[PDB]
Design a protein around this ligand. Sequence first.
Ligand SMILES: [Mg+2]
Ligand SMILES: [Mg+2]
Ligand SMILES: [Mg+2]
Ligand SMILES: [Mg+2]
Ligand SMILES: [Mg+2]
Ligand SMILES: [Mg+2]
Ligand SMILES: [Mg+2]
Ligand SMILES: [Mg+2]
Ligand SMILES: [Mg+2]
Ligand SMILES: [Mg+2]
Ligand SMILES: [Mg+2]
Ligand SMILES: [Mg+2]
Ligand SMILES: [Mg+2]
Ligand SMILES: [Mg+2]
Ligand SMILES: [Mg+2]
Ligand SMILES: [Mg+2]
Ligand SMILES: [Mg+2]
Ligand SMILES: [Mg+2]
Ligand SMILES: [Mg+2]
Ligand SMILES: [Mg+2]
Ligand SMILES: [Mg+2]
Ligand SMILES: [Mg+2]
Ligand SMILES: [Mg+2]
Ligand SMILES: [Mg+2]
Ligand SMILES: [Mg+2]
Ligand SMILES: [Mg+2]
Ligand SMILES: [Mg+2]
Ligand SMILES: [Mg+2]
Ligand SMILES: [Mg+2]
Ligand SMILES: [Mg+2]
Ligand SMILES: [Mg+2]
Ligand SMILES: [Mg+2]
Ligand SMILES: [Mg+2]
Ligand SMILES: [Mg+2]
Ligand SMILES: [Mg+2]
Ligand SMILES: [Mg+2]
Ligand SMILES: [Mg+2]
Ligand SMILES: [Mg+2]
Ligand SMILES: [Mg+2]
Ligand SMILES: [Mg+2]
Ligand SMILES: [Mg+2]
Ligand SMILES: [Mg+2]
Ligand SMILES: [Mg+2]
Ligand SMILES: [Mg+2]
Ligand SMILES: [Mg+2]
Ligand SMILES: [Mg+2]
Ligand SMILES: [Mg+2]
Ligand SMILES: [Mg+2]
Ligand SMILES: [Mg+2]
Ligand SMILES: [Mg+2]
Ligand SMILES: [Mg+2]
Ligand SMILES: [Mg+2]
Ligand SMILES: [Mg+2]
Ligand SMILES: [Mg+2]
Ligand SMILES: [Mg+2]
Ligand SMILES: [Mg+2]
Ligand SMILES: [Mg+2]
Ligand SMILES: [Mg+2]
Ligand SMILES: [Mg+2]
Ligand SMILES: [Mg+2]
Ligand SMILES: [Mg+2]
Ligand SMILES: [Mg+2]
Ligand SMILES: [Mg+2]
Ligand SMILES: [Mg+2]
Ligand SMILES: [Mg+2]
Ligand SMILES: [Mg+2]
Ligand SMILES: [Mg+2]
Ligand SMILES: [Mg+2]
Ligand SMILES: [Mg+2]
Ligand SMILES: [Mg+2]
Ligand SMILES: [Mg+2]
Ligand SMILES: [Mg+2]
Ligand SMILES: [Mg+2]
Ligand SMILES: [Mg+2]
Ligand SMILES: [Mg+2]
Ligand SMILES: [Mg+2]
Ligand SMILES: [Mg+2]
Ligand SMILES: [Mg+2]
Ligand SMILES: [Mg+2]
Ligand SMILES: [Mg+2]
Ligand SMILES: [Mg+2]
Ligand SMILES: [Mg+2]
Ligand SMILES: [Mg+2]
Ligand SMILES: [Mg+2]
Ligand SMILES: [Mg+2]
Ligand SMILES: [Mg+2]
Ligand SMILES: [Mg+2]
Ligand SMILES: [Mg+2]
Ligand SMILES: [Zn+2]
Lengths: 357, 206, 60
Amino acid sequence: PVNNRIQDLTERSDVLRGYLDYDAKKERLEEVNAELEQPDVWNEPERAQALGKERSSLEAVVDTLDQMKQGLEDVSGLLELAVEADDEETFNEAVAELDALEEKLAQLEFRRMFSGEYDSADCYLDIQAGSGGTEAQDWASMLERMYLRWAESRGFKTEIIEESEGEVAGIKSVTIKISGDYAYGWLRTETGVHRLVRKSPFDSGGRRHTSFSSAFVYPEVDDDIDIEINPADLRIDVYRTSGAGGQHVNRTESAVRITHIPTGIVTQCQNDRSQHKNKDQAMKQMKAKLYELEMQKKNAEKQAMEDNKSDIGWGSQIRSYVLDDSRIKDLRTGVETRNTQAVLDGSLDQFIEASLK
Amino acid sequence: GNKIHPIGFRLGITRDWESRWYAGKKQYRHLLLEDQRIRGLLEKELYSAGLARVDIERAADNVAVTVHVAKPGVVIGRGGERIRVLREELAKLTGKNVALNVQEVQNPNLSAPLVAQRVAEQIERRFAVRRAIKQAVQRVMESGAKGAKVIVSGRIGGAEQARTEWAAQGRVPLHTLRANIDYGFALARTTYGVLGVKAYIFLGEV
Amino acid sequence: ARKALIEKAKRTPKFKVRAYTRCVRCGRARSVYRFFGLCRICLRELAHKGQLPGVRKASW
RNA sequence: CGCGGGGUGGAGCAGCCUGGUAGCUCGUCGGGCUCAUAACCCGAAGGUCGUCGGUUCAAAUCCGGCCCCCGCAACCA
RNA sequence: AAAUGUAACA
RNA sequence: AGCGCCGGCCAACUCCGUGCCAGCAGCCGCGGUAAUACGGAGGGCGCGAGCGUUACCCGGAUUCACUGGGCGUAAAGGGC
RNA sequence: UGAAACUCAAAGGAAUUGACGGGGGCCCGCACAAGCGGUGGAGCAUGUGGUUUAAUUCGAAGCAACGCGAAGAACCUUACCAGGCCUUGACAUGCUAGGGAACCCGGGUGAAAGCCUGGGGUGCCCCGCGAGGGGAGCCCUAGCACAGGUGCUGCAUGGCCGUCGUCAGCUCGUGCCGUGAGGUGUUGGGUUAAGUCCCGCAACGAGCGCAACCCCCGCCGUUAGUUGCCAGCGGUUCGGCCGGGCACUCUAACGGGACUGCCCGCGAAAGCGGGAGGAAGGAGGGGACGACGUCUGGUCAGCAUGGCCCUUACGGCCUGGGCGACACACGUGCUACAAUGCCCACUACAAAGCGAUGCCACCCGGCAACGGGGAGCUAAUCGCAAAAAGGUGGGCCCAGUUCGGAUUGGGGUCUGCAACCCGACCCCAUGAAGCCGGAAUCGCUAGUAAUCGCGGAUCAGCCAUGCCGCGGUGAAUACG
Ligand SMILES: [Mg+2]
Ligand SMILES: [Mg+2]
Ligand SMILES: [Mg+2]
Ligand SMILES: [Mg+2]
Ligand SMILES: [Mg+2]
Ligand SMILES: [Mg+2]
Ligand SMILES: [Mg+2]
Ligand SMILES: [Mg+2]
Ligand SMILES: [Mg+2]
Ligand SMILES: [Mg+2]
Ligand SMILES: [Mg+2]
Ligand SMILES: [Mg+2]
Ligand SMILES: [Mg+2]
Ligand SMILES: [Mg+2]
Ligand SMILES: [Mg+2]
Ligand SMILES: [Mg+2]
Ligand SMILES: [Mg+2]
Ligand SMILES: [Mg+2]
Ligand SMILES: [Mg+2]
Ligand SMILES: [Mg+2]
Ligand SMILES: [Mg+2]
Ligand SMILES: [Mg+2]
Ligand SMILES: [Mg+2]
Ligand SMILES: [Mg+2]
Ligand SMILES: [Mg+2]
Ligand SMILES: [Mg+2]
Ligand SMILES: [Mg+2]
Ligand SMILES: [Mg+2]
Ligand SMILES: [Mg+2]
Ligand SMILES: [Mg+2]
Ligand SMILES: [Mg+2]
Ligand SMILES: [Mg+2]
Ligand SMILES: [Mg+2]
Ligand SMILES: [Mg+2]
Ligand SMILES: [Mg+2]
Ligand SMILES: [Mg+2]
Ligand SMILES: [Mg+2]
Ligand SMILES: [Mg+2]
Ligand SMILES: [Mg+2]
Ligand SMILES: [Mg+2]
Ligand SMILES: [Mg+2]
Ligand SMILES: [Mg+2]
Ligand SMILES: [Mg+2]
Ligand SMILES: [Mg+2]
Ligand SMILES: [Mg+2]
Ligand SMILES: [Mg+2]
Ligand SMILES: [Mg+2]
Ligand SMILES: [Mg+2]
Ligand SMILES: [Mg+2]
Ligand SMILES: [Mg+2]
Ligand SMILES: [Mg+2]
Ligand SMILES: [Mg+2]
Ligand SMILES: [Mg+2]
Ligand SMILES: [Mg+2]
Ligand SMILES: [Mg+2]
Ligand SMILES: [Mg+2]
Ligand SMILES: [Mg+2]
Ligand SMILES: [Mg+2]
Ligand SMILES: [Mg+2]
Ligand SMILES: [Mg+2]
Ligand SMILES: [Mg+2]
Ligand SMILES: [Mg+2]
Ligand SMILES: [Mg+2]
Ligand SMILES: [Mg+2]
Ligand SMILES: [Mg+2]
Ligand SMILES: [Mg+2]
Ligand SMILES: [Mg+2]
Ligand SMILES: [Mg+2]
Ligand SMILES: [Mg+2]
Ligand SMILES: [Mg+2]
Ligand SMILES: [Mg+2]
Ligand SMILES: [Mg+2]
Ligand SMILES: [Mg+2]
Ligand SMILES: [Mg+2]
Ligand SMILES: [Mg+2]
Ligand SMILES: [Mg+2]
Ligand SMILES: [Mg+2]
Ligand SMILES: [Mg+2]
Ligand SMILES: [Mg+2]
Ligand SMILES: [Mg+2]
Ligand SMILES: [Mg+2]
Ligand SMILES: [Mg+2]
Ligand SMILES: [Mg+2]
Ligand SMILES: [Mg+2]
Ligand SMILES: [Mg+2]
Ligand SMILES: [Mg+2]
Ligand SMILES: [Mg+2]
Ligand SMILES: [Mg+2]
Ligand SMILES: [Zn+2]
């Protein structure tokens, strides 16, 4: 039963050679070993440091794949060197071997997921209906069920934050917290518009219809916009008010103006008579105005997302659920599972694992 | 999908069984199976002859098979060549005294199974199905029949949308018990699919 | 899984319980009558042809 | 800083003053009607009473301190 | 006295 | 010896690839796993040192009607 | 007075056929109403949605999916899952080469499959007193074609079925009307269960439907008399048992019988109302039978089939598990909540079916399930077999009970290689909900509903309270 598990360590390791490109990185590795090889290469060591750190960046690829074809091959000869001599220690000592290379290959599979800043934060899934309407709101509810059963069959927590059910039948939108480990790595390769070509049940004479719904996926940040006001950067002017007051207002510097230096935000207050009532008030107004800019930043980045976020429309898609000839196709890598109502059960691993290249 | 089979609806009134014998509880499944294999072998071999009905009789360890056909010579052979060969293959299968007769079909164009098989052959030959159906009905009516109806169902002409196409002439009273209506079915295999051919001939009411 | 099943049903088993009837005509394991060896469908089908001796449509 | 009014299910409000008992409407959930949805009909679930402490036998309720909310006032030079 | 049913009819 | 075309108009049909994608398109319309309509091929049709495309003019357009049109309800009787 | 940009491949007039209308007229169907019994509440059985799972295979989706395919899932079935295995292979047609054919019998390993292996004699037409030489009977081994797939598409199909709907309809030929789609006929008046029939009519005919021909039941006859029957006469062991007989009942083949045929009345007719005769009256009751077509209805998983896909595996064998899960939700049913009832004892009256490793009389052991004996019956003979409600007696006394029989403990029986998951039955003990059910909703017009039991298919056994049949008792109501 053991040589079936070498059969698989050679399977994930070959298309691991595909996106890593041993063929395109055994090449680049050589003229960095050539540039750094002539004695003048520590001439502007910025040039040098990037390449010696590159060199193991490519020798964790080239030479790690070089210990997978030699290593597995000295595993499969030692486990036949234990069957035909009845030597059971040559087969515990060629299995302690298969537990070591099952990690150098596990480590090399975290070039799929260890490359995305924060691919570990408890991410959120933002599903939306789309073209079509009732049909697509049905398909939207189908697709939340799909990712819920997915997340349960993967150790995530199925945590639903916000729903809104559609008025005919189904869901217009949903947001789930996929509270789990490394959750963003898996579900970010699920971002896209899921077309569902399908056969439709809401159309009277039973016509074949297309309806789309999207899945957008993001991680979790600090979401704290409470910047502290530090006196290193506030310049506070004091001067006289401009209206009524008497020998006062004239003869007293009651008005204050606080200007945040790096921003250029200015603020005044003249409302009361004490400069400290006014210095108080202008500190408030100055707090709130930098609370409104840091607001304007965040919304600005959000609108940058929204306007760069597809449209859930015709020809904007990634999948077929042609349930009238039983396929589900991911036009992007692209695979073709034929066991359709097994995908809705949560076999997304298929597409995901191959889509992380 | 509704109409009753027009022969099984007249068994013992206007039309008679094709396997006429008695058998007990312990035996009648085995004799039935042997009958159906007799019909398989003959029904493959005697197709070119023009096979219409296959009657079967059974007494005790002997069995008489009566083959109705439009071309008797294609069954008999040259002085009995094929006719003897049949008895050897036959009593090889039966394992018992297998008497094989042959009879006329006086008018093959009043034989509904024959008309059906002929149309099925025509439509396997890429012929025009509508034209062919009208012709078959005309041949049956010219041969003296009191009525005729022919139906063809499937991807007619290769079309992707399946269709049913039929023609009739005279009287075909499928609700009348005493009305004698021969019925036949023929299966046509094309490159694009199967078509079904049904032929009803109303010979006369009894 | 079927021609292997119409075939396994023929061979005598290791235990006489494992024996079932299959329809000798279409291979159906369901609604097989012992006295014809046929399933209900083939029973109706041959009966309509008249190739079942004595069998007829029953009406009362 | 002042005066006095509030915080009670998912939402909006009632309950305090004369303490023991938290109610109404909408919503939510299960069932019905309908081909289906809405509407309607039947049944159900649902509240640390902002917090700390504590009046009393006993606090949503009474009395202090803090925390957010609302209104008013902040004048004469 | 009582609302509505989109989007791919051979 | 090349160029256009081969769904109808409009002369010239099959195989494969694709699978509302890639693309075609003068009009009507083609393409959602058996596409004579997309792309290639075989074959075919039409011209030939040319063949197609774009632009523009007349024609078809009696669709500004002199030849040679209309106005109850199609556009069209003015309120008298 | 009066544009343009931009945009569309139409916007339009009239007329035709449908469909629809909270338009009308005239009709019909347990459609409503009139009734009677239920469902929805309870406990349980069963199917389904979900959820769970390694898998809880797959299909069915308003009526017309949901005790549906499933007329028998412990293994088998089985198509799913896990694990152990096989590679022209569980199976077809081949061609080639090695062994011996063929068939039976064991040994090892193993959960089994499988892998390993030790046994033993091949007819033929043949040179055969001789080694020896085959051919092809069939198997084995190695190949190459091929097999195999319940993998997809019922929106590529055949076949078969569901449905509107047993509704009264849908058409064609020729002629006539219209430029034409099309109309006419088929509409109209009357009538019928009916496009049934009558009358009228630019229509006159014809076909598919309706009806009839077919089956069961109701009366009677003829022919038959055992294994069925017994009116009368003999015996009568005390039982149609015997003689005897076929009358009667019956059984099962063939006929008769009802046609609005006959009288009254209304009618132009067709028919309708009433009466007699008759077992039966106006289709006598029930059945079989389902028009052109519709639902891109259902079934590629019964079968067949086009194409697409799998080929040491999307094929095949096996062992085990799952299809039987359970916070929930719906459909179909079973048993009930009691006195028109429950229990005990005794005692009557069916029909249709089934039955030779089958149905089992009778006897004995056991409280029993059952077991051990053992006769009969290829079954109008013998057996399943007792029908149950009912009847006659006795107990219960209105209570969660002598109602109800769920759940659980314990002890057994039988089938089966094997009842853990996951069988049915018996016995002791336990003895739940349920006091007649919200909104809502189903069936049935007469031997019907209600209620009572009996049989069968499937089937080793059975999760059947399901299905298909059979008879017993036997209502209420229909103004409209
Ligand atoms: Mg001023
Ligand atoms: Mg001053
Ligand atoms: Mg001052
Ligand atoms: Mg499913
Ligand atoms: Mg398989
Ligand atoms: Mg098959
Ligand atoms: Mg069995
Ligand atoms: Mg069976
Ligand atoms: Mg003042
Ligand atoms: Mg050209
Ligand atoms: Mg075309
Ligand atoms: Mg041209
Ligand atoms: Mg042409
Ligand atoms: Mg593409
Ligand atoms: Mg082109
Ligand atoms: Mg297609
Ligand atoms: Mg193609
Ligand atoms: Mg081809
Ligand atoms: Mg073209
Ligand atoms: Mg092309
Ligand atoms: Mg020239
Ligand atoms: Mg030019
Ligand atoms: Mg022009
Ligand atoms: Mg002009
Ligand atoms: Mg003019
Ligand atoms: Mg004009
Ligand atoms: Mg107008
Ligand atoms: Mg106008
Ligand atoms: Mg005027
Ligand atoms: Mg004007
Ligand atoms: Mg109009
Ligand atoms: Mg009209
Ligand atoms: Mg109406
Ligand atoms: Mg009703
Ligand atoms: Mg009612
Ligand atoms: Mg009622
Ligand atoms: Mg109820
Ligand atoms: Mg219930
Ligand atoms: Mg639920
Ligand atoms: Mg399913
Ligand atoms: Mg299912
Ligand atoms: Mg139903
Ligand atoms: Mg069953
Ligand atoms: Mg079991
Ligand atoms: Mg199984
Ligand atoms: Mg198995
Ligand atoms: Mg279909
Ligand atoms: Mg389907
Ligand atoms: Mg079909
Ligand atoms: Mg006109
Ligand atoms: Mg004319
Ligand atoms: Mg006409
Ligand atoms: Mg005409
Ligand atoms: Mg008509
Ligand atoms: Mg008409
Ligand atoms: Mg009339
Ligand atoms: Mg009728
Ligand atoms: Mg008529
Ligand atoms: Mg007339
Ligand atoms: Mg009839
Ligand atoms: Mg009788
Ligand atoms: Mg007599
Ligand atoms: Mg009458
Ligand atoms: Mg369909
Ligand atoms: Mg098939
Ligand atoms: Mg197929
Ligand atoms: Mg299928
Ligand atoms: Mg198994
Ligand atoms: Mg099992
Ligand atoms: Mg099941
Ligand atoms: Mg279970
Ligand atoms: Mg419920
Ligand atoms: Mg129920
Ligand atoms: Mg039940
Ligand atoms: Mg009941
Ligand atoms: Mg109790
Ligand atoms: Mg009790
Ligand atoms: Mg209680
Ligand atoms: Mg009581
Ligand atoms: Mg009730
Ligand atoms: Mg009751
Ligand atoms: Mg109600
Ligand atoms: Mg009725
Ligand atoms: Mg009862
Ligand atoms: Mg029973
Ligand atoms: Mg039985
Ligand atoms: Mg049984
Ligand atoms: Mg059970
Ligand atoms: Zn069958």
